[PDB]
DNA sequence: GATGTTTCACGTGAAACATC
DNA sequence: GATGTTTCACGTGAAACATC
């Protein structure tokens, strides 16, 4: 089998009309099954190890703001700058209620966010 | 015959694989024959009016700042910001040499504006002097 | 070396002017 | 009303950090 042909699916990801959601999952699903890295994945794109990493982050946000994702509500943007907060679907609403641009959203995660418990001594 | 074929054909022009002078010829040449504004056009593709303009602007542009576009050595944004200069190939020559952002590229237009029209338009010189003309020799 | 994450420079597209 | 042009806000993608 041509080693070319997985080249080119690398590469056509980012052409065809996929959603930010659909691009990600295709890339981790890609770099599971052909055993290959983020830095190699985008040299194959033309792209940054970061845009990569940043891209795959998006599909464990939690399924309402990938809804926004899909819906176009949020932006990739939007929901990267929330992606490692406490509580993204609060953030989420936040940032539509108030209309906010990523600038301000990334404001926002900023200046926001537990004890386990046991019988007391 | 359908008119929804008109508004398909103006939809796919962003959707298909063409560079921004494709666009721009493709945008012009439908505008005429449909008998279209550009902000018809612009409502039709979900874009401004001034998007459309901007966009077929760059069909003015010499050739060789074309070339550039379609190579990708200057970006839409870069042309653009020279399309209304005195000189846009030499500004494109200093860009690409420069490596300047569009940002940059802005503030260069601005300092070297194309309201350097005021070149002399000649003439046989008068018999009598014209005082103020010859004053303006030395400034000039 | 591989990957997680944040901050900001960039070109793109639009607002804010202009003329005719 | 239609169109020419300039300036700047925006999201995208990458640099600059981090851990393991």
């Given at each position: 089998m041509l080693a070319v042909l997985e080249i080119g699916i690398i590469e056509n990801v980012q052409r065809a009309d996929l959603n930010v959601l659909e691009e990600a999952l295709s890339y981790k699903v890609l770099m599971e099954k052909f055993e290959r890295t983020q830095e190699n994945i985008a040299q194959t794109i033309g792209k940054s190890r970061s845009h990569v990493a940043n891209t795959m982050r998006?599909?464990?946000?939690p399924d309402e703001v990938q809804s926004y994702l899909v819906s176009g509500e949020l932006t990739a943007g939007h929901a990267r700058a929330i992606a490692?907060?406490?509580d993204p679907v609060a953030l989420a609403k936040q940032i539509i209620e108030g209309g906010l641009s990523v600038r301000e959203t990334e404001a926002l995660a900023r200046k926001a966010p537990k004890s386990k418990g046991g019988r007391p001594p």
């Open positions: 998006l599909l464990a946000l490692a907060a406490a």
